[PDB]
Every structure is written in C-alpha cells, then in structure tokens.
Write a protein that binds this ligand. Sequence first.
Ligand SMILES: O=c1ccn([C@@H]2O[C@H](COP(=O)(O)OP(=O)(O)O)[C@@H](O)[C@H]2O)c(=O)[nH]1
Ligand SMILES: O=c1c(O)c(-c2ccc(O)cc2)oc2cc(O)cc(O)c12
Length: 427
Amino acid sequence: KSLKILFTALFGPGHLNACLGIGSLLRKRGHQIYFAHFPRHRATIEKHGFLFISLLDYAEPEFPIVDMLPDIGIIAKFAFERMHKLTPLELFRHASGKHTFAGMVNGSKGENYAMMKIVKEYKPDVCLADYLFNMPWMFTVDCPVIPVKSVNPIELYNGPPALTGCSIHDPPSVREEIEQLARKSELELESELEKLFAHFNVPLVSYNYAQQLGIYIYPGPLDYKELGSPKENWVRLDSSIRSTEISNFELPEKLKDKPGKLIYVSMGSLASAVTELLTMILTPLANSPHRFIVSTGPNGDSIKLYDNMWGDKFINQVALLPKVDLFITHGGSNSLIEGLTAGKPLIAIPQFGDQLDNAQRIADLGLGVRLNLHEFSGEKLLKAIEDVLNDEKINANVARVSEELKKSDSKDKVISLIEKLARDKKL
Ligand SMILES: O=c1ccn([C@@H]2O[C@H](COP(=O)(O)OP(=O)(O)O)[C@@H](O)[C@H]2O)c(=O)[nH]1
Ligand SMILES: O=c1c(O)c(-c2ccc(O)cc2)oc2cc(O)cc(O)c12
C-alpha cells in the first residue's frame, strides 16, 4: 500500500518548490518521500517530513557537482544587460542559434552519475524530477520516472515557439522570423543533449518526452487550450504550492499606518542576485504614492530602500501574498501561480526563458501587464501600477482564476496516476 517515492530537481528553488507541493499530497496518502537535492535545502525538505539525500555525497571524482545557486548572478547579469539593450527580436538575431540553456547540458553529467548511484541504493518504486530537459538516468534506472515541469508549458504544444514571449495578437509577419530563429536554436539543444546521452550510451529522447506519465503545473484557465493538447503522457496539475511556513504574516511597522496600496516586489530565486535590476526598479518607486514589500535577494543588504519600502533577502512569499494588492514579478511560474491563487494581479518584467512566455500570457489573458526592460522607465512602471490597480476588468479576471484554482480537483487524477504507475509500472 505504502510507496517509496524519490524526488530530485535542479538547483533553482522554483523547481524544488514545485516538487515539495507534490511531495506533500503524496505524504498525506501515507507514502515515504525521499528528496535528492542540495544541503542548503535539507531544512525545508526535512521540515515537510521527506528524507534528505545530498547530491554532493554521490559525486564521481572525474565529474564534480557544485550547487550553482550562490553564483547564478553572473549568468543572470548577462541576461539583464542584453534584455536592457535589445528588443526580444534583436536578442534572438544576436543569439545566432545559441539556445537559452544548452550551455547547462554538458555540465549535467555529474548529477546524472549521482542519481544512478542514489536510485540503485534507495531502490524506490517511482522517481519524479523537475529539470529543464530529460537526463539519461531517467531511462536507465529500474523504476518509472515522471518528469515534473514547473516552467511555462507552451513547449509541450505545437504553437508559438517557446522562450520567445510571443502574443496571441501577434501578426503572422513579426512571428515568422522569431519562429525561424527559435527552430535554429532548438537544434543546438538537441545536439548538446545528443552528446550527454551518447556519454552514457542511452538512446536520445526528446528534451520534454514523458515515457509513461509527465506532470506539468499550470492553472487550467491559463493553459494553452487554443493550441489543442499537450504532448503524450503529459497531465496538468493546476497548482503545487508547498505547506505555508507561518499561516499568519506580521506586516512591518514601517509600512503600517502609511498611505497607499501594498505592493510586493520580487524578481525571483535567480534574477534577484542582479542588484542593478532591483535598483533600476526601486529608484522610481520612491515617488510612487504606495507601499512596497521587497524581496532584495542574496545581495539585498547593499540595495537602498526608501521611506515607503520594507524588505529582506528572503520573504515568506506564500504567507505575504494574501495581504498585498499587486505583485511586481519577473514572470516565474511559481510566483504566477502563488499570485493568482491569492487573487493578486501581476506586473511581469521578464528576465530570461519561460519568464517571457508567462509575461505575455499575463498580458494576453488580462491578468496584469508585461513591462519590457528595453522600454523601461520610471514613468511607464508608475503608470503600469496605476493602470492595473484601477482596471476592474483585470481585477475581475484574476478573481475568476483565483476561484478556479481554489475549487480545482486536478490533484485527485494526478495522485491516482502516480500511484497506478508506481504500483503497475505502466499506465
Ligand atoms: O523572497 C522570496 C522569493 C522567492 N520565493 C519563492 O521562490 C520561488 C520562485 O519561483 P519562480 O518560478 O517564480 O521563480 P524562479 O525560480 O524562476 O526565479 C517561489 O516558490 C516563491 O515562493 C520565496 O519564497 N521568497
Ligand atoms: O540559461 C539558463 C537558464 O535559463 C536557467 C533557468 C533556471 C530556472 C528556470 O526556471 C528557468 C531557467 O538556469 C541556468 C542555470 C545555469 O547554471 C546556466 C544557465 O545558462 C541557465
């Protein structure tokens, strides 16, 4: 009756958090949850009651593994400088067939060795893995393996190219070029995955193939129903929000009894490392007639806050969101779902990857506005705030999606499929 279930994910807290959500549902049904991740997440993993396994304890001498979270800013600073200078079209021309995350693929060999040893030792009944791309170990281990996807799922559909930020209102002419450039760089990803798979003598699969079951996490009302169905074996979970740390969130006395709406500002787990980005956003908000709670990121201690702002490096985002009126976000999927669950509209300033797809989805479906870094001004950000605060149509759309997310029973089907696959080893 009781299953051994092993989770893993890449370093990004977004990938871990999505998995923690599914791990909760499965623990409530009486299964033993294991989580293979990095020592900086042992505390949260063990607090949710999962057994913690360190990726670092299973490293191969010739393939060392490092947690890239303390040094992701270098990568995120490059994305910022480019997105600040270039339009999304100009950025794709420049990329010259270079894919957004093909550079990570060669570096994956170490984690792959580690997971082969970990799945052999712990002999689980099923594995789940939130990665940006399939990894050889998922096809060599005895048990079935369910890819979990927490990024924007447009990549699972035949439609606008992914990582591009295309609109449903975009004319065929503007879209023909971006489509062409994206197809060119998608094959750079395939060629890099070929080398990684060849390294382990495993036949190459599509980067987002699900052999039996795949779980993508996106709200039904935002899912791409106008493009048809996702790829085979891929099933939607409307949300995967981890257990709240504190149920009640005490507001800081600085922003209490002060004039204006209450606005949350975070640029995520990764982009938040770029102090120049937060500084660009916060400087003009000094003279926005409202109150800001700011996630300042790993370098937050060196970021100036003004009289209408309170902030810490890390914020309890899930506890906070119910108390705010508006969320200024980077376009991360967990932040999107956390925000819409709380019923808050979004101003999305996308930085890299699926964030552009999520930002354009927020715009296209009347759940907030997209603000591009190339066009960014204090004038346009302050107007975006006033427009979205006062737009009854947007605030109605968000409330509607909020209700669809609370009432969702998508979790019921998804739990059954995980249990069926784990016990039957097929669907
Ligand atoms: O101060 C903070 C900043 C972020 N987060 C969490 O970090 C995740 C960010 O995921 P998302 O996909 O939105 O961003 P990304 O991982 O792409 O940066 C979400 O679960 C947030 O709740 C948090 O708890 N506190
Ligand atoms: O290009 C990259 C990228 O897009 C991402 C990413 C992480 C989490 C997401 O949710 C979405 C994207 O991580 C990276 C990590 C690296 O060490 C190097 C990279 O080049 C990327």
